Symmetry: C4
Subunit: 277 residues, 4 copies
């Protein structure tokens, strides 16, 4: 949806987010590029001063570009030294830039290092089938890394359209009661279940009624990943179509032919359903 006020950019809000999200190769290409053009600009600036670089072919961009590069990176070989206030002032400027550039490039790199992905797999569907004697809404999550997640929290939120007394129709949110919503240590898989008891918002609902109310289900996951020593977040949304009534997730905890327990995420998205003649 379009906004009408100040829809784009601001302070510390250039496409800086892009430098945080984009792929490493693209990130390195952007930096490398920004590195070359800046040395291209200083190279010109030196030429715009005439022949202020000793031992350099007059009016040559090359020798001027490489002089810049040797100044900014602070390599300072010594054959291409500066000449006269003009060059020595651009050098002072270019010295500061390379320092700021490094400072920045290091900031962005450490940042990108600290915004890791949750590495959490969400089942492609939800199911509503009996558990402990009651119809239950379920879905499951799997930890795709060997590192464990500490203090994992999950929320199952129902979003649908309802009518107020004043006659207004708005989107209402419902944090659904889970049998377990907190997991001290998340390591493998976790089946999140919502018992549909008399207190449930979807009690008495059917696939049809949920469609009418434009019902949707949000799953929000958060925890402290040991792999990154910092919190991670992940979420998924499910529409009515993605709910398998009568479905039962296929166990993923396999017992190996040789007395060992194993987890086979290959069956993670499998649902067992009964068929009628």
């Amino acid at each position: 949806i379009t906004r009408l006020g100040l829809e784009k950019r601001g302070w510390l809000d250039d496409h800086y987010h892009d430098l945080l999200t984009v792929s490493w190769p693209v990130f390195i290409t952007l930096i490398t590029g920004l590195y070359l053009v800046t040395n291209a600009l200083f190279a010109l600036a030196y030429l715009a001063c005439g022949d202020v670089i000793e031992n350099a072919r007059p009016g040559s961009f090359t020798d001027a570009f490489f002089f810049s590069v040797q100044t900014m990176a602070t390599i300072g070989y010594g054959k291409l030294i500066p000449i006269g206030p003009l060059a020595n002032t651009l050098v002072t400027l270019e010295a500061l830039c390379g320092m700021l550039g490094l400072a920045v490039a290091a900031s962005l790199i450490y940042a990108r290092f600290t915004r890791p992905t949750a590495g959490v797999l969400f089942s492609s569907r939800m199911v509503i089938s009996d558990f402990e004697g009651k119809p239950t809404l379920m879905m499951r999550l799997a930890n795709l890394r060997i590192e464990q997640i500490i203090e994992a929290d999950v929320h199952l939120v129902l979003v649908r359209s309802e009518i107020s007394q004043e006659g207004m129709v708005f989107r209402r949110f419902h944090d659904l009661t889970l049998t377990r919503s907190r997991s001290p240590i998340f390591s493998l898989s976790w089946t999140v279940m919502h018992p549909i008891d008399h207190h449930s918002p979807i009690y008495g609902e059917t696939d049809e009624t949920l469609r009418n109310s434009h019902s949707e289900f949000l799953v929000l996951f958060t925890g402290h990943h040991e792999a990154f020593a910092q919190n991670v977040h992940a979420r998924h949304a499910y529409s009515c179509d993605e709910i398998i009534w009568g479905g039962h997730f296929v166990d993923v905890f396999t017992t190996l032919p040789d007395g060992r327990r194993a987890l086979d995420l290959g069956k993670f998205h499998e649902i067992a359903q009964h068929h009628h003649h």
Copy 2:
């Protein structure tokens, strides 16, 4: 009437325990708060002056800058720069134990300088603004058949804030049994104090039922107690992959009894909707004949 809290949630009271600075509390905050243009200017500033100070220190040792014009500040200044930034061309080289001891020291300063400047730059990167807009006013009107205190927030960025929650706190003066007058905070029960995905607009509501601290209050009674309303919002901003928060405060005057916020969406010429934050602060009201 002095408002205890400003609109941006800050305090409007004077401090008499006046104690200026401390350790790690110089302008360390002024470098993290100020704007980039100023931040950069200040840094460049400390950069030039620092090189200036050294340039002089070399002159105090007389002529210790080989291949440099005697007494020249220019030549000593550019020697400093070349040294501190570690460019080290080779023409201006030092001379004698004195010049070389400054070099060693100046080398450490530029080293520490880079480290500090890199810290500041990163830190400034880790204090993103929440980009959350508060409605200029609050309103009290019917929702689900009950008078409800309302106000709203809007996300000013395209990226969404998740695991967001809000706090609506009443602040007023009261009198204890011991006949003491004090200011007491009352966290207000919201119909919903969390938003899984905060992406457009959100109308926060406080039903004024029997359990409410303002149950039975009126514009007059709220005024006499000097009632104000504080709002804290927090969330995880995906844009920066880190948490953010926002605060706002309202006085009795900013409550429109009977008002209702107006739908914030318009229709572009083609026909598709669009959040018109221009109407975000608009409030509908019934006018009597």
Copy 3:
């Protein structure tokens, strides 16, 4: 009997969804986990080889290293180093557009190299260990007149951990009405699950009252359900000024029914107490005639 959870709380199950690496998931974790000696060795390693690769790249361009011995790796290698580290003495200077394009590139690599190495070093600094010791066993004995599941932790550092809390979770196999067998977690009610200042030792307790998942269980019954006990501890370590956590797990075999932990303090020759972590795992038991 395969124990679902290892003692250090990790999983003892095999993964068949075998998918090795990804992005930002190379050995990025191996550099953060490994030991300093290895970390440094690996870095030094990548440092030498990288300079080695460039040294060769210059040789491919023939003789472009002025004042360097033709075909010499040694001279080209030390040119690389001098360039990448930006020392730039002045004797080995480049020659021709080819040599100068490598220099420009090598300058960027060392630049990025420093940034990365500085990141890793800082990161490794931000993953402190909790330095928390778990008792090798658990015990079930009377406290306040009730059988109580107990275990204890000890701080292995002089600095204290504050705002600490612990979690004792039972993990066992159960059968649903639909006749399904699954593993269910049961967070256990502790007499106290928080420690304001964790500095010495702490005995965590779970009274086994009517509300307990192990109310009425025995060593036999726990075994049949393959019951295990998971413990998570977290706190703010003042030593590093950041949060830390620790995990441990126990099997039925590690519960000493009737046992009691022994006071962990001794008496030095002078006469003052001292936490003897040597007795930390000791358990008193009554022996029958």
Copy 4:
């Protein structure tokens, strides 16, 4: 209390904590020092190779020290270049060190920047006096900075010795119920109160009984300081002696002679007490 197992140091546990806590001046002196001795060692190493530094007085420490300094800092003037595999290998080594050194020195500096003090003042005493009709245990906190603290939490914990049924005497903790324990925005002062109702652990206690049980009171404060954009922690402990029975804190919110409201922390530690003829 002395520990008996492995009482001192370990990995990433050198007196590194000291480098994090110690004062800046001392920190800079330690770094500067570590900077000089390292260049003193390399200087020697070059001498232990003979005269491998061109244009340098033979066997001279000075010229060798400064050569090192010019190598490590990567200034590389060019008059003191290296000579023969020995020098060129120590240079490669010293190049790596300066890089690691900078990397480290920057780590420590940014760290020290991110472990700020809460800047919270605790009243020097506690009081037990009537509030809303009940005897109440109180104390107060003040924010010593203008920046505000978000999501401030405070706990008042009673620690005293009690006897179990098994006859064992141990230290029991009691998280005391506060009238308000959470403050969304902490800006000035905050009086933390514990109503001593029938449910209170100190109900019916006197100064004498609290002394016998070796009662103590812990106050723990935490919140997100805007000044540092990161959490802060502070705590204080109070003994029975520091409880003023019948005391009343002197209001600190002053009304300025000119219609303005002011906070005068000068009276923060003042308690009003009644006196008998």
